[PDB]
Amino acid sequence: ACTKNAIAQTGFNKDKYFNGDVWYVTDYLDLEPDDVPKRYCAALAAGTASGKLKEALYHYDPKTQDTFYDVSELQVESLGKYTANFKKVDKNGNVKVAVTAGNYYTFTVMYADDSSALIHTCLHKGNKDLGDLYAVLNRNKDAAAGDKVKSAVSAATLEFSKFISTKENNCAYDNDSLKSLLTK
């Protein structure tokens, strides 16, 4: 179940966020902690491609090796709040599961700057969801969270100390696949 209406950053800069580069999840927190494994890897590319707002999302259980790529044209609810009906694809963009109305996440950017971000998502796969999931992002795979994003976690009335780190999972990312998936 999702329970939060996350507030987007006032003055969110969409061109900077959706610039075609990769964001790495460095830390995450699910309000239903059993919905996501304690050890998990994720990254996303966010861009505009041929005038469509796009995201390509990767996730990987580092212990089971299960690997997933999703691709979505986003639809806009408000500046910094999006609905992403996704298709499951291989790393090359080949469709494995077509878009279908019930398979979507919402995506809210609570804080962003040039190097870091805090997002909330609510995933739906049919009648089931993955809970409220918050993620700290960085442009650099190994970056410890800085004061700006940690303060944004506090501003959301969350405790960064409770976030789970992804840094000890031996995560590796196909950056090239993520970027090229934006076009698919």
CA 147 to chain centre: 20
Contacts of 48 (CB under 8 A, 6+ apart): 18, 20, 54
User: Which residues pair with residue 107 across a beta bridge?
Assistant: 82, 121
As given in the structure block, the two tokens for residue 111 are: 């804080």
CB atoms near residue 122 (< 10 Å): 21
State the resolution, in angstroms. Answer: 1.1
Per the CB < 8 A criterion, the answer to whether 47 and 182 are in contact is yes
The verdict on whether residue 120 carries a ligand-binding annotation is no
CA 177 – CA 179 distance, rounded (Å): 6
Q: Which fold has domain 1-184?
A: Lipocalin (2.40.128)
Neighbours of 153 (CB within 10 A): 22
Cβ count within 10 A of residue 86: 23
Helices (H) and strands (E) in the chain, counts: 3, 10
Q: How far apart are CA 117 and CA 170, in angstroms?
A: 22
**Cα gap 84→114, rounded to integer Å:** 23
Burial of 91 (0-12, 13-18, 19+ CB in 10 A): middle
In contact, 119 and 4? CB cutoff 8 Å: no
**Residue 56 parent element (H or E):** strand 52-60
